[PDB]
């Protein structure tokens with residue numbers, strides 16, 4: 001069965017069919033400030049809620065490539081949704097990827113953690129890669145790079161799709177914006193009037209960024 005993780009926004013959840021899915025890679029893409037990292041921090045709390053509150057009683061693996069994970073933003077979102085900020089942080093396993101090759105290795109390490117927690121009452125249910133593409137865009141540049149970059153990212157995305165399907169995990173990846181993509185679901189995020197963010201699947205959802213992370 002596909003699990004669904006609430007985003008915190010009822011509007012965005014509706015657009016997604018109820019939340020971010022397990023057994024799928026969901027890519028959010030959009031310009032600087034569009035909400036990609038804030039959505040990631042909000043899902044890393046939401047997935048820890050029980051299912052009747054929109055979570056999967058799950059743990060989180062987060063591969064951070066631009067040093068934008070903020071443990072205090074997690075604690076705030078958790079505190080404000082009525083969860084213990086330190087227990088929520090204990091269930092997020094963060095690793096910094098130093099380059100695209102290290103990023104690829106970290107996905108194989110993630111399988112070790114996933115296997116370990118599979119017999120626990122908080123199995124990994126969410127794997128975040130923020131940003132999926134930043135290192136690949138820095139490292140593979142110039143004539144011949146398009147093909148090489150796309151082949152390396154296809155292998156990385158295949159590794160991630162295997163973990164999502166084999167272990168019933170939601171994979172959530174971000175991309176800052178003609179080239180091919182292989183996410184299961186692609187969600188375009190942009191800034192709207194009045195501080196809102198607007199999401200479109202590639203209706204529209206509208207959400208805010210608040211003390212609770214993301215919400216309508």
Ligand SMILES: Nc1nc2c(ncn2[C@@H]2O[C@H](COP(=O)(O)OP(=O)(O)OP(=O)(O)O)[C@@H](O)[C@H]2O)c(=O)[nH]1
Nearest residue numbers: 031032033034035036037038039073176209210211
């Ligand atoms: N309340 C709160 N808002 C924040 C915080 N950090 C960022 N924001 C707001 O959230 C908006 C969305 O930011 P992000 O999710 O980081 O943007 P992004 O899409 O990841 O951007 P890039 O990483 O630059 O591609 C920002 O414009 C800020 O207005 C925070 O720690 N607390």
Ligand SMILES: [Mg+2]
Nearest residue numbers: 036037038068
């Ligand atoms: Mg970001």
